[PDB]
Design a protein around this nucleic acid. Structure first.
Lengths: 97, 138, 27, 225
RNA sequence: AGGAGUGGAGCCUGCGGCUUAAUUUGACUCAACACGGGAAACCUCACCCGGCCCGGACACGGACAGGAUUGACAGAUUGAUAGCUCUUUCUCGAUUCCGUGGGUGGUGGUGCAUGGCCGUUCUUAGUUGGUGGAGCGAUUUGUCUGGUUAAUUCCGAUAACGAACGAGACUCUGGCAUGCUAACUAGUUACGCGACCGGUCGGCGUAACUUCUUAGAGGGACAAGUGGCGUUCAGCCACCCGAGAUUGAGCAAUAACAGGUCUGUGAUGCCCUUAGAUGUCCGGGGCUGCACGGCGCUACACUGACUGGCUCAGCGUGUGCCUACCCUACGCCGGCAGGCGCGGGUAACCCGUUGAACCCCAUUCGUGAUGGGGAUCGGGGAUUGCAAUUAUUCCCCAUGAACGAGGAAUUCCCAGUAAGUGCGGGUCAUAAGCUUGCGUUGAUUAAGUCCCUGCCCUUUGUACACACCGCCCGU
């Protein structure tokens, strides 16, 4: 199956600008209406997330067939300093007060 | 004219609409004399006509009991006859006539007017019916 | 009163460790 | 588009089940007791009932805000159409879920089973309940599993007045040996919100309310003003 | 005591027999077996088989810059969209076989490591402290002689007194209401319709309605009762101002099982390592290699017939938020499966007054092989779904294997029950002879018993305590 890099870069950017991704993804079908425009197979995202957990930077919760992630300062800093995406983009996990 | 006595046997849907005239009961378009079952006729016609034919000319009653089943509208028609007569003679004649007509309608029927709450009973799991199970243990 | 040995004994009053638990409970 | 009435009732039930399970899994470290939900036109308000408020709101109201997101992004509400607040339940020992969570937490900290159970039973007795029984089932000592329970006070096991007079909670605690199950059952007093006192008549159980008897004056002559 | 029943005179699956597996993964029964809601043509526990796969896309032993990742395809590429015979071979394409932690898919174990949830002992009425009494003690009393209740239910007796759980009370449910200052779905006091001996004002809409319907919301009435039996108590058996005089279910205790489930689980202890990995591809196919002594079926007959009879007695589903896949009225193709078309329905509003029996029963019963099969394959023409080969195909057609309820032996049954019939719901792209609910149905009952099979209490015996499937003796 296809292994790109810029699709994952876009997924990382949307994760940083949101905190959680909102796109139902099915391994069996290449495209789902929510999956579309972010065409990376579910398997890619959850395998990368399992590798991330084996490394460890982000927080998570699970409920009724659904993930609920939480991006803290560690994940913000890591996505900031690895992909050399400058801090001109402000995270969406600290909005308001 | 309001008497508020009705006639209701089992679950049949009935109407007792009262306004002066002859006492007639319409069943599937068949009046009281010529009845739908065509086999329980005497048991319903005996009490009224042997005493008088103008006896029902007091207050006409629309009795249109859409009853299905012969035990349903049969004896419901006589329930309606007795109840309408007793209520009319109760509210609109006097107390002594009330007493005597109630006596004759009670020697007509001692105590069987109103029943207990019961019908066909529910089914339980583990068997084909209400009180029955699967293969036997002798 | 120590409760750990009491629970260990109450789980099995005649087990492999019954004698030691009962002895520890005595004193 | 719009759906049928029975389907809307089933859907709100499944949403409530989703929410309760989610907030039990997520808010398992604060001490989770329950939830209330209220509805007004396009405004749905959810309240998480827990024993610790200063701990559940979080720093600068972070978690309480964050929860909104994980509701909004999941339940499919329109943007900014979900509000949620936080108040503290008046009592703690009368909620079976709360005491089950407390026992689970105590067994999570390594505190021994019997002393933890004794503590929770004593709390419930001091809480005002006229009966509690807790059961810890599974492996406590050894390879085989023991079901160990303590009961004190009163506890009805049958009839209808076990839904509105007994609170029951079942929870699981993991261990290097396995899983321990905690069942907490609590009796409730007669009048609502933990026996405040007699109010407008809503009788639910047998009681003999004996008032003070009339007293006559001893002096032969009556009162003079 | 009977009725209906049964590997016998059809239909659906669970053993009587097994090695191209063909079926039994839970059984010491009645607590395995139409059960895993398990009807597998979806990829079913794959099952058996010429099955293109990688489902290593966890960061660190070799790691190229092509792990090698299609084919409707002319006997040489010998299956309907598997280049799995032959250095042929390609319009996204750089994408690795692994040492610190249940990882490839987490349906694979251990349910004797467990939780939870069930089943069973438990359909029976049993269970337990505190203080006090007895005993050296295990233990006992309370928890009982008796009367006697469905009941450790209650009278009572009383070295016990007070209590606790269970039982009952409680909840839902059933041929009961002349108030709902109540309703366009249901008729209707005085309007405006109206032949006819106060009506189509339910065809604007009676602001009083209400009687059925809403069993939809507020109620009472087994003792202001009688007779008899009983210690005149607890109670029981029949009835003289009189709707109501054991509806059926739910919940269901202490202590237990090596009962079932790790193949429901983001509920979890203890694990595996290396090629068509249990996950994609399997045209064909898994119990179907099967003879009514495991559910649901035949009355040798006026109690039974095809509408001259129905103003009917009557559970509960139904469409697009992920997601196309719902219920269907009405016309045409039509004298019909099936197809087309506009239409209604988020539902007392449409299917619908749901086609839940035809009671006189307008083809119409004398010694009843022959209306109680027609021991079923030919025919207008045969499916919204790849696969219908033992299976959703579909509207229906002369006596012919049974003959009067067909016994070795059996996880049935007492007031609208048994037993006919059918209609729904779960399963459901297709589908129910499965299961779970719903309809027209009774009593003069048997108002019984402990002889079977079991259970409970008391006394008693025991050499039993792994508890009679025990212990044990001798050749």
């Amino acid at each position: 199956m296809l292994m790109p890099k810029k699709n994952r870069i876009a997924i990382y950017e949307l994760l940083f600008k949101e905190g959680v991704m909102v796109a139902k993804k099915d391994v069996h079908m290449p495209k789902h209406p929510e999956l579309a425009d972010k065409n990376v197979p579910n398997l890619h995202v959850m395998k990368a997330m399992q590798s991330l957990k084996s490394r460890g930077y982000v927080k998570e919760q699970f409920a009724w067939r659904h993930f609920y992630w939480y991006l803290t300062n560690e994940g913000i800093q890591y996505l900031r300093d690895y992909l050399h995406l400058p801090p001109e983009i402000v995270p969406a996990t600290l909005r308001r007060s | 004219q309001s008497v508020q006595v009705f006639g209701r046997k089992k679950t049949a849907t009935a109407v007792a609409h009262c306004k002066r005239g002859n006492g007639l009961i319409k069943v599937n378009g068949r009046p009281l004399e010529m009845i739908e079952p065509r086999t329980l006729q005497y048991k319903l016609l005996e009490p009224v006509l042997l005493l008088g034919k103008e006896r029902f000319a007091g207050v006409d009653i629309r009795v249109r009991v859409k009853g299905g089943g012969h035990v349903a509208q049969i004896y419901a028609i006589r329930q309606s006859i007795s109840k309408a007569l007793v209520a009319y003679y109760q509210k609109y004649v006097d107390e002594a006539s009330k007493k005597e007509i109630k006596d004759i309608l009670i020697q007509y029927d001692r105590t069987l007017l109103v029943a207990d709450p019961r019908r066909c009973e529910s089914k339980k799991f583990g068997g084909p019916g209400a009180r029955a199970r699967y293969q036997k243990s002798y | 009163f120590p409760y750990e040995v009491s629970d260990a004994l109450q789980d099995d009053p005649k087990g492999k460790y019954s004698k030691k638990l009962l002895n520890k409970l005595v004193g | 588009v719009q759906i049928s009435k029975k389907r809307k009732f089933v859907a709100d039930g499944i949403f409530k089940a989703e929410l309760n399970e989610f907030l039990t899994r997520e808010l398992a470290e604060d001490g989770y007791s329950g939830v209330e939900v209220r509805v007004t036109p396009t405004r749905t308000e959810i309240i998480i009932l827990a024993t610790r408020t200063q701990n559940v709101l979080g720093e600068k109201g972070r978690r309480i805000r964050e929860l909104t997101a994980v509701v909004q992004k999941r339940f499919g509400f329109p943007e900014g159409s979900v509000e949620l607040y936080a108040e503290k339940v008046a009592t703690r020992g009368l909620c079976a879920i709360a005491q089950a969570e407390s026992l689970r937490y105590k067994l999570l900290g390594g505190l021994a089973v019997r002393r933890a159970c004794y503590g929770v039973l004593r709390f419930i007795m001091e809480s005002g309940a006229k009966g509690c029984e807790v059961v810890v089932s599974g492996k406590l000592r050894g390879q085989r599993a023991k079901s160990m329970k303590f009961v004190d006070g009163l506890m009805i096991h049958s009839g209808d007045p076990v839904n509105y007079y007994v609170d029951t909670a079942v929870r699981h605690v993991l261990l290097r040996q396995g899983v321990l199950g905690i069942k907490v059952k609590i009796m409730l007093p007669w009048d609502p919100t933990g026996k405040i006192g007699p109010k407008k008549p809503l009788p639910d159980h047998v009681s003999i309310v004996e008032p003070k008897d009339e007293i006559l004056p001893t002096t032969p002559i009556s009162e003079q003003k």
